[PDB]
Copies of this chain bind each other. A is one copy, B any other.
Amino acid sequence: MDLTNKNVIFVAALGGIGLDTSRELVKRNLKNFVILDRVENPTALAELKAINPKVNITFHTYDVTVPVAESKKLLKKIFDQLKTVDILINGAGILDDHQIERTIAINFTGLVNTTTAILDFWDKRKGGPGGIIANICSVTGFNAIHQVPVYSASKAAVVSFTNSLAKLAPITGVTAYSINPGITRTPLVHTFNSWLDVEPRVAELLLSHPTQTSEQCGQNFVKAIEANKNGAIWKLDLGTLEAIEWTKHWDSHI
């Protein structure tokens, strides 16, 4: 998939691995790069524009926790200006098991709602042109870091949801795949809260094992996008890009 002249919407582009992914994306000569984030980041925005002035970069304040009606309102405005949107990247996320409700609302519910909102413009059943959805999940969605069970569980949910989205492609015209980074040194400062404080040294311990750089992840992130494989479960761990096969324990046959 050629990203040249493509219109992309990136939710939470200015955070964590999102920034390094954004840096790589803008280098691909996109036509429009729409960033939707809850918090304004003038510095990051300035850097991106400086990387490739050719790309039209616009920022819109967006809280993934708002109702679907709210998201449809904002998306309508964007589709009105761009006419078309080729890819949507859902990258909102939080890691803090002391915030149970918020973790689920941001990592799981918000992703599902934003996806549900855009389907209103992309659903081929409604005469839409279809589209592509790239969901940023996590390797914890495969096998949890049991010390942060809520975060891990919310990610397992998105890995499943994304897998389902891909299977619905023939009906909606919307393809999808998940991007699952392993442990990376992207969160500016490492120190997250474990559920019921079962392990206050989780960050410290995790960093005691092989990790990957934020840049290594960003580059593989774009490579996965260009691969454009519907239903792919991409694992971005230790600087490599690999598609894992989901084990089949049960089938619905439909």
Q: Does A232 contact B (CB under 8 A)?
A: no
The size class of the interface chain A forms with chain B is: 35 or more
Residues of B close to A154: CB separation below 8 A: 157
Contact with B along A134-177 (1 / 0, CB 8 A): 00000111111111011011111111110111011001100000
Residues of B close to A164: CB separation below 8 A: 144, 146, 149, 152-153
Judging by beta carbons under 8 Å apart, are A101 and B108 in contact? Answer: no
Interchain nearest-CB distance for A150 vs B (Å): 6
Judging by beta carbons under 8 Å apart, are A209 and B254 in contact? Answer: yes
Q: Does A73 contact B (CB under 8 A)?
A: no
Residues of B close to A39: CB separation below 8 A: none
Q: Does A1 contact B (CB under 8 A)?
A: no
Closest-by-CB residue of B relative to A100 is B112
Judging by beta carbons under 8 Å apart, are A139 and B196 in contact? Answer: no
Judging by beta carbons under 8 Å apart, are B198 and A168 in contact? Answer: yes
Q: Does A253 contact B (CB under 8 A)?
A: yes
Judging by beta carbons under 8 Å apart, are B153 and A112 in contact? Answer: yes
A147 to B146, CA, bound (A): 29
Judging by beta carbons under 8 Å apart, are B146 and A163 in contact? Answer: yes
Residues of B close to A113: CB separation below 8 A: 100
Judging by beta carbons under 8 Å apart, are A156 and B145 in contact? Answer: no
Judging by beta carbons under 8 Å apart, are A254 and B142 in contact? Answer: no
The 6 closest A-B pairs by CB, nearest first: A149-B164, A156-B160, A146-B164, A142-B249, A157-B157, A146-B167
